Design a protein around this ligand. Structure first.
Ligand SMILES: Nc1ncnc2c1ncn2[C@@H]1O[C@H](CO)[C@@H](NC(=O)[C@@H](N)CO)[C@H]1O
Ligand SMILES: Nc1ncnc2c1ncn2[C@@H]1O[C@H](CO)[C@@H](NC(=O)[C@@H](N)CO)[C@H]1O
Lengths: 136, 136
């Protein structure tokens, strides 16, 4: 699993066209104020262990930034060892559940399987942009 | 070299704190309307050949999107095989020059070696977000 942590002043997205034959989540849109936006690429061989490590780290980074909202944003573009869409969806669902066991704030999992438009204002501080990998 | 192509409706950035002891470019800020924003991570072993392949591809993708502005945005976070900062800066300078030989529109190389704040509104169409790697 490959992740990009973006500490945002604000974030919003809207699904547009389906990116998969049949997206496993319904379409939608949401917007937020200050949040950690976690661009999440599920990789082949990610399993429950991988999810749990990632959940703990997101939690720990969120605490360090004093943020109370995390967006789990499915992203197909952070690596060249993608898991297939069904495995990917499953792991993102597990990640959402796992994060709630480690982090007390708002967790928003954005829909999987769509192209999206988005807008973000990413903060300038030294820890506002970082990437992290997890495996098992 | 690892790149992320974001077709934006608008883009802006501002350097904040120096991210390197002595950043090789001066601080600054710019904003744009419709542009291809190329988050660019220089990797160990990128050379002139790598640059030229990347320049041709950016050019060809820009043409396909009918965009006339490309932002070359130094980004340290797209892979785990980073070139050292001096090699990285050099390659980004080469990339800027190479792109101008292949693409007729506005090429803006954003400064290297700073933390930055940025804001982007990324389009929803199917080719609005893609990643590409180049090597030699
Ligand atoms: N291995 C993987 N990890 C994370 N997400 C993955 C995935 N495989 C498929 N997806 C999802 O399906 C959409 C099309 O690839 C993806 N959509 C996106 O990447 C949009 N942000 C592009 O606008 C994503 O929702
Ligand atoms: N291998 C590499 N490829 C591309 N850029 C690289 C690099 N090594 C260092 N940099 C630059 O130095 C800043 C701190 O890493 C980097 N700054 C950034 O990545 C900001 N957008 C974070 O806010 C970047 O300008």
């Amino acid at each position: 699993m490959r992740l990009l942590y973006l500490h945002a002043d604000r974030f919003e997205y809207k699904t547009v066209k389906p990116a998969l034959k049949n997206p496993p989540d319904p379409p939608g849109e949401a917007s937020f104020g200050e949040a950690l936006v976690v661009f999440t690429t599920v990789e082949d061989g990610d399993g429950p262990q991988t999810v749990m490590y990632a959940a703990s780290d997101i939690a720990s980074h969120s605490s360090r930034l004093k943020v109370t909202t995390v967006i789990l944003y499915p992203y197909a573009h952070l690596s060249s060892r993608l898991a297939k869409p069904m495995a990917a969806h499953k792991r993102l669902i597990e990640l959402e559940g796992a994060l709630r066991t480690k982090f007390p704030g708002h967790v928003h999992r954005a829909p999987f399987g769509w192209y999206k438009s988005f807008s973000i204002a990413c903060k300038g501080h030294p820890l506002a942009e970082l990437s992290r990998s997890f495996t098992e």
